[PDB]
Design an enzyme around this catalytic site. Structure first.
Site, short mmCIF file in Angstrom:
data_model
loop_
_atom_site.label_atom_id
_atom_site.label_comp_id
_atom_site.label_asym_id
_atom_site.label_seq_id
_atom_site.Cartn_x
_atom_site.Cartn_y
_atom_site.Cartn_z
NE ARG A 197 -48.07 -15.41 20.96
CZ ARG A 197 -49.18 -15.41 21.69
NH1 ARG A 197 -49.47 -16.46 22.45
NH2 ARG A 197 -50.03 -14.40 21.61
CG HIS A 219 -52.43 -14.22 19.22
ND1 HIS A 219 -52.46 -15.50 19.73
CD2 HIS A 219 -51.20 -14.05 18.68
CE1 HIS A 219 -51.30 -16.08 19.50
NE2 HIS A 219 -50.51 -15.22 18.87
CG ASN A 246 -52.88 -19.43 18.78
OD1 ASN A 246 -53.84 -18.68 18.95
ND2 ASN A 246 -52.04 -19.74 19.74
CG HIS A 247 -55.45 -22.25 21.65
ND1 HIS A 247 -55.25 -23.11 22.71
CD2 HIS A 247 -54.63 -21.19 21.86
CE1 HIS A 247 -54.35 -22.61 23.52
NE2 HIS A 247 -53.95 -21.44 23.03
CG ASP A 249 -56.94 -18.79 20.37
OD1 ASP A 249 -56.71 -19.40 19.31
OD2 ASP A 249 -56.03 -18.44 21.15
CG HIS A 306 -58.81 -19.19 25.14
ND1 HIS A 306 -58.24 -20.26 24.48
CD2 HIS A 306 -58.09 -18.10 24.79
CE1 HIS A 306 -57.23 -19.83 23.74
NE2 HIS A 306 -57.12 -18.52 23.92
CG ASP A 360 -58.05 -15.15 22.08
OD1 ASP A 360 -58.08 -14.43 21.06
OD2 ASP A 360 -57.07 -15.85 22.38
CG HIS A 369 -56.16 -15.71 16.57
ND1 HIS A 369 -57.13 -15.59 17.55
CD2 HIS A 369 -55.08 -16.25 17.17
CE1 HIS A 369 -56.65 -16.05 18.69
NE2 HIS A 369 -55.41 -16.45 18.49
CG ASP A 402 -56.91 -25.89 24.00
OD1 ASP A 402 -57.33 -27.00 24.36
OD2 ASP A 402 -56.30 -25.72 22.93
NE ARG A 403 -54.81 -21.15 26.17
CZ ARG A 403 -53.72 -20.74 26.81
NH1 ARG A 403 -53.59 -20.92 28.13
NH2 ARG A 403 -52.75 -20.16 26.12
#
Ligand SMILES: C=CC[C@@H]1/C=C(\C)C[C@H](C)C[C@H](OC)[C@H]2O[C@@](O)(C(=O)C(=O)N3CCCC[C@H]3C(=O)O[C@H](/C(C)=C/[C@@H]3CC[C@@H](O)[C@H](OC)C3)[C@H](C)[C@@H](O)CC1=O)[C@H](C)C[C@@H]2OC
Ligand SMILES: *C(=O)CCCCCCCCCCCCC
Ligand SMILES: [Ca+2]
Ligand SMILES: [Ca+2]
Ligand SMILES: [Ca+2]
Ligand SMILES: [Ca+2]
Ligand SMILES: [Fe+3]
Ligand SMILES: [Zn+2]
Lengths: 107, 169, 352
Positions: free
Chosen positions: C234, C261, C130-131, C98, C72, C70, C179, C101-102
């Protein structure tokens, strides 16, 4: 209300008094746990001082119940936080906020 | 002040009794009884200590720019906050909190100074400076690198903050 | 303090005559918080998307490879990552998803990684996380970011590009790189191949699982031996077991499942090893140090070469400050300005 659930201990005797400057590190989250802000983001500990109405109610009632070195989860309710007005840009109306607060020091 | 002299003319939302009432407030406040009112006298009472905006309010009220808030200014000032006060005069007041030198434009330095005033040590200065830069880069629509009332209101205009800038008289 | 450059990079500045992006020019600009011309940004996104669209669901990657977790939106840590892992100019990379985001620098991450993909289409691989979807980016700060820095046009471009991201990678005929992890409806590599990748990940199903799975919080000392269980954390997908992973592995003759992940304090986690091979059945690699500026974790990159899986760790790097949700100083200070200003008067009037 403001429900406090401990994460880390701290000395179970040194609680903060009114007028005393509480030095803390926090990480605020929405009820779903999605973070919205943190003092760690700025590497600056948030300093406020009990009694003087410098933070939302949940914090006054919650941080009072904490001992130095204690890290706890304050689960504050809207009426004790931002109510229905919320807070422009960050806090949605009628929101419950969970704060991971770590009482670092007193001054 | 307490006594005579020639007529004070002003403009406001207040009726005959609200002015009387405010007149009595200005009275207690007068301390040295000079008729005017200065920061030392405002600083006089309990909850005007850690209100980082107190000297700001005094300066906006001080329309004639002589350091003291005279009765006319006291009335004109509090009138911005009266109910019956329109949203626009309230946002204008807000603009004046950042617009230090009153020239109609909030400059980078003023925005930083006014914010530092309220934030203190809860943010590093580089952090504060960074976000001040980025707010001006984005709101500066007209080009001169300083925020005008037009641009302020473009970012702020839809916020309901003014609905709370209301005092009972 | 430095100020972000007002000059937006133009096409001829980013792309040379051969149509090759100049990642060096790009890196330097982006690091000063510089923006590109929306058209150039769009070209990077769209040209990378075209490359990804042609790749297979399950990529076939040869070692040597630096596998990364990740990212992010932590662009400045993405710069450190490359210092530790090697120049993309001569190092094969594989990212497990990923990217957004974040972190408040998600667009610089996609732009730099997409340009790098345009530049090294056969040595730099990007997998889907997943993002990299619509529901998560609207929820988190990515959409808002694209609107503040560029526009929704760029945002939409990224969305359609994300739909082109491969789902997995078969590295060195040995590891299954994804991921999230395993899925009940994926018992062989062909099951991944037969999936339709080009869409928003479903509410459930094989594609959802790949992107969302997690090993049980007790991936070794279990009493049950249940293969898949619903992932209560999740709010979707599953939790897979050591017997589950050992079943997938034996069945498909794979060595281990490399994935990301999940934040790790050491930037990685080696799970229970196979009783046959002395190798971990599962591996989590996490490349975002000091996650969310909260977690004080280290990040890491897997470096696989000459039959050796070496883990390199790295620490956080400095980055500019953005108020929560890209909120501006006015919107930020106003409620407080109102409160106090009103308080001064209330106090002032209450003297009678
Ligand atoms: C000039 C700048 C503004 C000035 C900012 C600073 C000193 C910087 C400081 C680190 C705040 C953070 O800035 C990154 C940011 O912290 C939050 O994310 C957050 O975690 C939070 O909830 N905190 C912060 C920690 C104490 C508890 C609580 C709070 O009590 O906060 C207070 C608060 C917002 C009270 C409102 C005020 C309006 C009333 O109407 C309402 O009454 C219902 C209650 C803060 C301390 C105000 O005294 C001061 C300011 O606002 C908010 C979601 C929004 C806030 O930004 C605005
Ligand atoms: C001192 O310098 C004078 C301060 C006292 C002011 C009170 C005057 C009362 C005003 C009431 C009349 C209403 C006007 C429409
Ligand atoms: Ca006086
Ligand atoms: Ca005056
Ligand atoms: Ca000015
Ligand atoms: Ca301007
Ligand atoms: Fe992640
Ligand atoms: Zn993930």
């Amino acid at each position: 209300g403001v429900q406090v659930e401990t994460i880390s201990p701290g000395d179970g005797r040194t609680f903060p008094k009114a007028g005393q400057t509480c030095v803390v590190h926090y990480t605020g989250m929405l009820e779903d746990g999605k973070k919205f802000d943190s003092s760690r983001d700025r590497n600056k500990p948030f300093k406020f001082m009990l009694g003087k109405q410098e933070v939302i109610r949940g914090w006054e009632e919650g941080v009072a119940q904490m001992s130095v070195g204690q890290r706890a989860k304050l689960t504050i309710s809207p009426d004790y936080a931002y109510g229905a007005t919320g807070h422009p840009g960050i806090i949605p109306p009628h929101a419950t906020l969970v704060f991971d607060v770590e009482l670092l020091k007193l001054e | 002040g307490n006594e005579a002299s020639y007529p004070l003319e002003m403009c406001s939302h207040f009726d005959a009794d609200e002015i009387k009432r405010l007149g009595k407030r200005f009275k207690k406040l007068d301390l040295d009884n000079s008729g005017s009112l200065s920061v030392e006298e405002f600083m006089s009472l309990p909850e005007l200590q850690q209100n980082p905006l107190v000297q700001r309010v005094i300066d906006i009220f001080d329309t004639d720019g002589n350091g003291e808030v005279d009765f006319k200014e006291f009335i004109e000032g509090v009138s911005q906050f009266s109910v019956k006060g329109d949203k626009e005069q309230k946002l204008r007041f807000a603009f004046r909190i950042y617009d230090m030198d009153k020239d109609g434009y909030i400059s980078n330095g003023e925005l930083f100074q006014v914010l530092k005033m309220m934030v203190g040590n809860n943010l590093k200065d580089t952090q504060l400076q960074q976000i001040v830069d980025k707010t001006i880069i984005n709101a500066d629509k007209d080009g001169d690198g300083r925020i005008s009332f037009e641009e302020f209101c473009a970012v702020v205009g839809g916020l309901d903050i003014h609905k709370k800038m209301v005092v009972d008289v | 303090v430095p100020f972000p450059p007002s000059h937006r990079l133009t096409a001829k500045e980013v792309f040379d005559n051969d149509g090759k992006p100049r990642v060096d020019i790009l890196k330097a600009h982006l690091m000063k918080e510089g923006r590109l011309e929306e058209t150039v940004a769009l070209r990077i996104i769209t040209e990378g998307a075209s490359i990804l669209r042609q790749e297979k669901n399950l990529l076939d990657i040869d070692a040597p490879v630096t596998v990364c977790g990740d990212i992010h939106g932590q662009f400045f840590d993405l710069m450190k990552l490359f210092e530790v892992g090697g120049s993309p100019a001569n190092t094969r990379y594989l990212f497990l998803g990923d990217y957004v985001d974040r972190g408040y620098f998600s667009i610089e991450c996609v732009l730099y990684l997409w340009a790098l993909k345009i530049l090294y289409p056969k040595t730099l691989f990007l997998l889907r996380g997943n993002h990299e979807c619509r529901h998560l980016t609207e929820y988190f700060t990515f959409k808002q970011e694209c609107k503040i820095k560029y526009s929704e046009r760029v945002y939409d471009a990224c969305m359609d590009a994300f739909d082109c991201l491969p789902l997995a990678a078969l590295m060195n005929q040995q590891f299954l790189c994804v991921h999230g992890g395993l899925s009940p409806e994926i018992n062989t590599l062909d099951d991944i191949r037969k999936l339709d990748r080009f869409k928003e990940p479903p509410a459930y199903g094989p594609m959802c699982d790949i992107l969302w799975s997690d090993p049980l919080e007790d991936f070794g000392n279990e009493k049950t031996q249940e293969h898949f269980t619903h992932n209560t954390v999740r709010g979707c997908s599953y939790f897979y077991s050591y017997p589950a992973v050992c079943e997938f592995l034996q069945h498909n003759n794979l060595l281990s499942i490399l994935r990301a992940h999940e934040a790790q304090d050491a930037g990685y986690r080696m799970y229970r090893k196979s009783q046959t091979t002395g190798f971990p059945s599962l591996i989590t690699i996490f490349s975002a140090p000091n996650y969310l500026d909260v977690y004080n974790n280290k990040a890491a990159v897997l470096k696989y070469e000459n039959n050796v899986m070496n883990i390199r760790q790295f620490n956080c790097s400095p980055h500019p400050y953005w108020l929560p949700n890209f909120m501006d100083v006015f919107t930020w200070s106003l409620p407080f300005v109102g409160e106090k200003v009103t308080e001064m008067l209330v106090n002032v009037l209450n003297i009678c």
